[PDB]
Design a protein around this ligand. Sequence first.
Ligand code: 9JT
Ligand code: 9JT
Ligand code: ZN
Ligand code: ZN
Ligand code: ZN
Ligand code: ZN
Lengths: 153, 153
Amino acid sequence: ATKAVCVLKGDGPVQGIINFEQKESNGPVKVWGSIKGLTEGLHGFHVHEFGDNTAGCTSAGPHFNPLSRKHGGPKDEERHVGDLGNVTADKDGVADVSIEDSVISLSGDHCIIGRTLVVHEKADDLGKGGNEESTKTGNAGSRLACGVIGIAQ
Amino acid sequence: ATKAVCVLKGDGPVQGIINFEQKESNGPVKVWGSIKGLTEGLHGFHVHEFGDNTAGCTSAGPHFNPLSRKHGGPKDEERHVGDLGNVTADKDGVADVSIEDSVISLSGDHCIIGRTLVVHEKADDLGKGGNEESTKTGNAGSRLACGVIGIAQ
Ligand SMILES: O=C(Nc1ccccc1)c1ccccc1[SeH]
Ligand SMILES: O=C(Nc1ccccc1)c1ccccc1[SeH]
Ligand SMILES: [Zn+2]
Ligand SMILES: [Zn+2]
Ligand SMILES: [Zn+2]
Ligand SMILES: [Zn+2]
């Protein structure tokens, strides 16, 4: 098994801990944890290309897209590798994250270790927003919190 | 060329930005940047095994040591991959970092991306301190600041 972890930090405080576990290189990645300090509703959840947080979340670059595809939701064939959809925050502002994803990996050229996990202001429209931006970013607004994805024990 | 970057933060005044560049596969890695908020003198400079900053620097684990060697300095044969020696802070508390290292890498088994860069309270004795701890950690004291090493553009 390979394991990774990410601390999400940004103003609010929006703060979170996200764990990644992959039992074999050819297998899905289980993504679990918690994010607090969010507004109730959906928040875009992306792996951005660079693990560069030198100017905060703005330095992380575009959606991680090694295969040169368009933006989508995690269940879509047409998606970026970094398209993990939305997390859902309750009325206490807590998003309990539980995702399994077959496209991200913790090895090979879909590897997300060393890249930036980002939680967004607004919902990711999953490429179904009806404008040009929808199929590039999903219109999820500002980057509320982020962190670099690291190797875990 | 491959590039990586790391933002060093902690609980106190120490903060920094460190850049990594490796022009050729299996070539030396250039390390440069700046750290401020330090006491004047030598400060241990390590890649630790885990990119896990969930409890700050304390979760980063031992020295990155994929080859099962003892602790040393960067110019020693007997060293951990993560043994980058010391950085030097001036009387303004600023350390200008400029290192070339041929043991760390930005790809493969020696890869430091997704691991934690740590700057220490005290000098790393480079395995020459005269106690057992010297050849395990180098006696560099507390972890003042750290961050996860991320992929850069
Ligand atoms: O292993 C990685 N990439 C990779 C890319 C292409 C072929 C084989 C391997 C990787 C690189 C940097 C950080 C994290 C990982 Se997982
Ligand atoms: O690139 C990496 N490994 C790797 C391993 C075997 C073949 C090719 C590449 C890597 C994995 C995890 C974190 C960081 C790096 Se740089
Ligand atoms: Zn995003
Ligand atoms: Zn996308
Ligand atoms: Zn250390
Ligand atoms: Zn060491």
